[PDB]
Write a protein that binds this ligand. Structure first.
Ligand SMILES: COC(=O)Nc1ccn2c(N[C@@H](C(=O)O)C(C)(C)S(=O)O)c(C=O)cc2c1
Length: 244
């Protein structure tokens, strides 16, 4: 069938075509595979941006700072996007990347509990600093693409140190696509408050046979670039490798 060389060339071209620099790590069982046009990004640290929402949710639910049915009401103040000017649950906010909701959840958790929980889960460099409501957007919290795909691997298999129910609740919030009997769970991310800007799409594919294949795409976001480029390159890569 297809040679490794051909797969590597195809996926690298997906990043080349988007005129950006990026990498996508795929994990099968315990083996990591790095693809893309800037492989060294694999072990470099970047702010997690919205990918942190996955953990924010885990923490909030576990520590009873919210429930999956609770509706977070829009305070009526102007928001970056009109789509965020509404009342939503944690899951709706996850799908809409509604930062205001997760900033409220972070504030409910509190700096002390948050630092302690991030440390406990051993997420990235585990340092949240002194600002409980923006540490995942502008630092000091950072994480590498390898750590992100491993975090996705752990959540997909319920290995994180949270009740099985909590993990299951959050995973249900991450279904973003179904393709040929395959289900794609993932959370996107875009650190716009950092330079250069980082883009993420972390999650996993659940194949019909029940096997789960974690992944983490990480690239540099540039002005005039569509957020859906993260999704397109991820889907093309996954498909080129026969994952979906
Ligand atoms: C305190 O900062 C602010 O007030 N603003 C913003 C403005 C946009 N933000 C994102 N991006 C989404 C979007 O813009 O549609 C994406 C779906 C592309 S992303 O994949 O989540 C975040 C997720 O990283 C976080 C923010 C914060």
């Amino acid at each position: 069938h297809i040679s490794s060389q051909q797969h590597e060339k195809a996926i690298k071209s997906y990043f080349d075509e988007a005129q950006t620099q990026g990498v996508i790590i795929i994990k099968e069982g315990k083996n990591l595979s790095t693809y893309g046009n800037a492989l060294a990004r694999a072990n470099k640290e970047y702010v997690p941006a919205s990918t942190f929402k996955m953990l924010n949710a885990l923490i909030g639910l576990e520590n009873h700072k919210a429930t999956t049915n609770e509706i977070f009401k829009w305070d009526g103040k102007k928001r970056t996007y009109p789509m965020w000017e509404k009342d939503m649950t944690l899951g709706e906010a996850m799908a809409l990347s509604a930062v205001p909701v997760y900033q409220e959840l972070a504030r409910r958790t509190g700096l002390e509990l948050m630092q302690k929980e991030v440390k406990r889960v051993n997420f990235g460099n585990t340092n949240i600093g002194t600002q409980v409501d923006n540490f995942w957007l502008v630092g000091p919290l950072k994480i590498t693409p390898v750590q992100e795909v491993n975090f996705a691997d752990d959540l997909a298999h319920n290995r994180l140190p949270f009740k099985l129910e909590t993990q299951e609740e959050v995973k249900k919030m991450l279904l973003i696509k179904e393709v040929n009997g395959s289900k794609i769970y993932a959370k996107s991310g875009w650190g716009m408050g950092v330079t250069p800007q980082v883009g993420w799409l972390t999650g996993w594919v659940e194949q019909a046979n029940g096997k789960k294949i974690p992944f983490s795409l990480n690239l540099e976001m540039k002005e005039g670039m569509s957020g859906s480029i993260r999704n397109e390159i991820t889907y093309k890569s996954l498909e080129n490798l026969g994952i979906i």
